[PDB]
Protein backbone atom coordinates (compact mmCIF):
# COMPACT_ATOMS: atom_id res chain seq x y z
CA UNK A 1 0.00 0.00 0.00
CA UNK A 2 1.09 3.62 -0.37
CA UNK A 3 1.66 4.99 3.14
CA UNK A 4 0.24 8.53 3.47
CA UNK A 5 -0.57 10.53 6.61
CA UNK A 6 -4.26 10.47 7.49
CA UNK A 7 -5.43 7.24 5.85
CA UNK A 8 -7.38 4.49 7.59
CA UNK A 9 -5.84 1.23 8.83
CA UNK A 10 -7.53 -1.45 11.00
CA UNK A 11 -6.06 -3.23 14.03
CA UNK A 12 -6.60 -6.99 14.46
CA UNK A 13 -9.57 -6.71 12.14
CA UNK A 14 -11.41 -4.70 14.81
CA UNK A 15 -10.64 -1.02 15.52
CA UNK A 16 -9.83 1.69 13.01
CA UNK A 17 -7.15 4.38 13.39
CA UNK A 18 -5.43 6.84 11.02
CA UNK A 19 -1.77 6.81 9.87
CA UNK A 20 0.36 9.57 11.42
CA UNK A 21 3.62 9.81 9.41
CA UNK A 22 5.89 7.59 7.32
CA UNK A 23 9.22 6.93 9.05
CA UNK A 24 12.26 4.74 8.90
CA UNK A 25 14.38 2.98 11.46
CA UNK A 26 17.59 1.92 9.65
CA UNK A 27 16.33 -0.27 6.79
CA UNK A 28 12.93 -0.77 8.49
CA UNK A 29 9.90 1.12 7.12
CA UNK A 30 7.16 2.15 9.58
CA UNK A 31 4.55 4.77 10.43
CA UNK A 32 3.99 6.57 13.73
CA UNK A 33 0.48 6.49 15.23
CA UNK A 34 -1.45 6.65 18.55
CA UNK A 35 -0.49 4.24 21.34
CA UNK A 36 -4.13 3.62 22.24
CA UNK A 37 -4.72 2.22 18.68
CA UNK A 38 -3.03 -1.18 19.31
CA UNK A 39 -0.86 -3.43 21.48
CA UNK A 40 2.60 -4.67 20.57
CA UNK A 41 2.32 -7.32 17.84
CA UNK A 42 -1.22 -6.26 16.87
CA UNK A 43 -1.76 -6.61 13.08
CA UNK A 44 -2.40 -3.51 10.93
CA UNK A 45 -4.26 -3.77 7.60
CA UNK A 46 -4.72 -1.26 4.85
CA UNK A 47 -7.51 -1.99 2.37
CA UNK A 48 -7.84 -5.43 3.84
CA UNK A 49 -4.14 -6.31 3.29
CA UNK A 50 -1.68 -6.92 6.12
CA UNK A 51 0.95 -4.15 6.04
CA UNK A 52 2.84 -4.68 9.40
CA UNK A 53 2.46 -4.95 13.19
CA UNK A 54 2.74 -2.66 16.19
CA UNK A 55 6.41 -2.65 17.16
CA UNK A 56 6.05 -0.58 20.29
CA UNK A 57 3.66 1.70 22.11
CA UNK A 58 3.15 3.67 25.30
CA UNK A 59 -0.43 4.30 26.51
CA UNK A 60 -1.65 5.72 28.87
CA UNK A 61 0.95 8.11 30.44
CA UNK A 62 1.91 9.04 26.83
CA UNK A 63 -0.03 8.05 23.69
CA UNK A 64 2.36 6.83 20.95
CA UNK A 65 3.27 3.85 18.83
CA UNK A 66 5.10 2.88 15.62
CA UNK A 67 4.07 -0.03 13.31
CA UNK A 68 6.94 -1.70 11.43
CA UNK A 69 5.82 -2.50 7.91
CA UNK A 70 6.76 -5.09 5.36
CA UNK A 71 9.24 -4.32 2.63
CA UNK A 72 6.48 -4.13 0.10
CA UNK A 73 4.98 -0.90 1.48
CA UNK A 74 5.69 2.46 -0.14
CA UNK A 75 6.47 5.22 2.31
CA UNK A 76 5.58 8.72 1.12
CA UNK A 77 6.41 12.11 2.63
CA UNK A 78 2.75 13.24 2.36
CA UNK A 79 -0.41 13.88 4.35
CA UNK A 80 -3.86 13.47 2.77
CA UNK A 81 -5.92 16.66 2.22
CA UNK A 82 -9.02 15.46 0.36
CA UNK A 83 -7.69 14.39 -3.05
CA UNK A 84 -4.56 16.53 -2.63
CA UNK A 85 -1.48 16.20 -0.44
CA UNK A 86 0.62 18.25 2.06
CA UNK A 87 4.33 17.48 1.74
CA UNK A 88 6.14 16.68 4.97
CA UNK A 89 9.18 18.96 5.24
CA UNK A 90 10.33 18.41 8.86
CA UNK A 91 9.28 18.52 12.50
CA UNK A 92 9.86 22.04 13.78
CA UNK A 93 7.44 22.40 16.68
CA UNK A 94 4.98 25.31 16.29
CA UNK A 95 4.20 27.61 19.22
CA UNK A 96 0.83 28.45 20.87
CA UNK A 97 -1.19 30.54 18.43
CA UNK A 98 0.15 28.87 15.27
CA UNK A 99 -2.36 27.61 12.73
CA UNK A 100 -2.34 23.85 12.28
CA UNK A 101 -4.23 21.14 10.39
CA UNK A 102 -4.87 17.46 11.14
CA UNK A 103 -5.91 14.65 8.76
CA UNK A 104 -7.78 11.42 9.64
CA UNK A 105 -10.21 8.85 8.25
CA UNK A 106 -13.27 10.28 10.07
CA UNK A 107 -13.43 14.04 9.60
CA UNK A 108 -10.87 14.48 6.77
CA UNK A 109 -8.48 17.44 6.96
CA UNK A 110 -9.48 20.11 9.50
CA UNK A 111 -7.50 23.22 10.55
CA UNK A 112 -7.45 25.56 13.54
CA UNK A 113 -4.84 26.82 15.94
CA UNK A 114 -2.81 25.52 18.81
CA UNK A 115 -4.26 26.70 22.09
CA UNK A 116 -2.23 25.18 24.87
CA UNK A 117 0.64 22.77 25.47
CA UNK A 118 1.38 20.31 28.24
CA UNK A 119 -2.26 19.38 28.73
CA UNK A 120 -3.37 16.29 30.69
CA UNK A 121 -6.28 14.15 29.37
CA UNK A 122 -7.89 11.94 32.01
CA UNK A 123 -8.96 8.99 29.86
CA UNK A 124 -10.85 6.02 31.34
CA UNK A 125 -7.59 4.03 31.15
CA UNK A 126 -5.41 6.58 32.95
CA UNK A 127 -3.99 10.06 32.45
CA UNK A 128 -2.05 11.06 29.36
CA UNK A 129 0.21 13.99 30.07
CA UNK A 130 2.05 16.56 27.98
CA UNK A 131 -0.48 16.80 25.15
CA UNK A 132 -0.73 19.89 22.91
CA UNK A 133 -4.23 21.26 22.38
CA UNK A 134 -5.62 22.71 19.15
CA UNK A 135 -9.15 23.69 18.10
CA UNK A 136 -9.30 21.91 14.73
CA UNK A 137 -12.25 19.45 15.20
CA UNK A 138 -11.88 15.68 15.05
CA UNK A 139 -13.92 12.49 15.49
CA UNK A 140 -13.71 8.85 16.63
CA UNK A 141 -11.46 7.15 14.09
CA UNK A 142 -9.13 10.18 13.67
CA UNK A 143 -6.73 8.91 16.36
CA UNK A 144 -3.15 8.47 15.29
CA UNK A 145 -3.67 10.85 12.34
CA UNK A 146 -1.23 13.58 11.42
CA UNK A 147 -1.08 17.11 12.89
CA UNK A 148 0.90 19.33 10.45
CA UNK A 149 1.33 23.02 9.56
CA UNK A 150 0.54 24.09 5.97
CA UNK A 151 4.24 24.68 5.64
CA UNK A 152 4.81 20.93 6.09
CA UNK A 153 6.18 20.84 9.63
CA UNK A 154 4.79 17.69 11.33
CA UNK A 155 3.59 18.42 14.91
CA UNK A 156 2.27 15.06 16.25
CA UNK A 157 -0.46 12.42 16.15
CA UNK A 158 -4.10 12.64 17.23
CA UNK A 159 -4.79 11.39 20.75
CA UNK A 160 -8.30 12.47 21.78
CA UNK A 161 -10.72 15.23 22.65
CA UNK A 162 -14.19 16.25 23.80
CA UNK A 163 -16.24 14.03 21.51
CA UNK A 164 -19.94 14.93 21.54
CA UNK A 165 -22.82 12.50 21.09
CA UNK A 166 -22.37 12.61 17.28
CA UNK A 167 -18.84 11.14 17.63
CA UNK A 168 -16.88 14.36 16.88
CA UNK A 169 -16.41 17.91 18.19
CA UNK A 170 -17.18 19.51 14.79
CA UNK A 171 -20.77 20.64 15.66
CA UNK A 172 -19.53 22.85 18.58
CA UNK A 173 -17.70 26.17 18.21
CA UNK A 174 -13.93 26.25 17.92
CA UNK A 175 -13.79 28.10 21.19
CA UNK A 176 -15.26 25.02 22.88
CA UNK A 177 -13.16 22.32 21.25
CA UNK A 178 -10.36 20.41 22.95
CA UNK A 179 -8.53 18.28 20.36
CA UNK A 180 -5.32 16.75 21.77
CA UNK A 181 -2.22 15.46 20.00
CA UNK A 182 0.93 13.71 21.14
CA UNK A 183 4.10 15.65 20.19
CA UNK A 184 6.09 14.00 17.38
CA UNK A 185 9.57 14.98 18.66
CA UNK A 186 9.69 12.67 21.66
CA UNK A 187 8.26 9.76 19.60
CA UNK A 188 11.12 10.14 17.04
CA UNK A 189 13.88 10.16 19.68
CA UNK A 190 12.30 7.51 21.88
CA UNK A 191 12.26 4.98 18.97
CA UNK A 192 15.26 6.26 16.96
CA UNK A 193 13.06 7.02 13.90
CA UNK A 194 13.67 9.38 11.01
CA UNK A 195 10.82 11.19 9.32
CA UNK A 196 10.38 10.58 5.54
CA UNK A 197 10.43 14.10 3.92
CA UNK A 198 10.06 15.49 0.38
Amino acid sequence: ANIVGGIEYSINNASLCSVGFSVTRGATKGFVTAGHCGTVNATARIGGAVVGTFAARVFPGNDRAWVSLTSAQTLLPRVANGSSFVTVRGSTEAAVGAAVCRSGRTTGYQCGTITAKNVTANYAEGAVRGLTQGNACAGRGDSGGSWITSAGQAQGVMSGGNVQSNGNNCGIPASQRSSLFERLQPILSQYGLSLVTG
Binding site: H36, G139, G160
Partner: peptide, 4 residues
Protein backbone atom coordinates in the same frame (compact mmCIF):
# COMPACT_ATOMS: atom_id res chain seq x y z
CA UNK B 1 -12.14 13.81 26.95
CA UNK B 2 -11.79 10.43 25.30
CA UNK B 3 -9.35 8.77 22.93
CA UNK B 4 -10.26 8.94 19.19
Amino acid sequence: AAPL
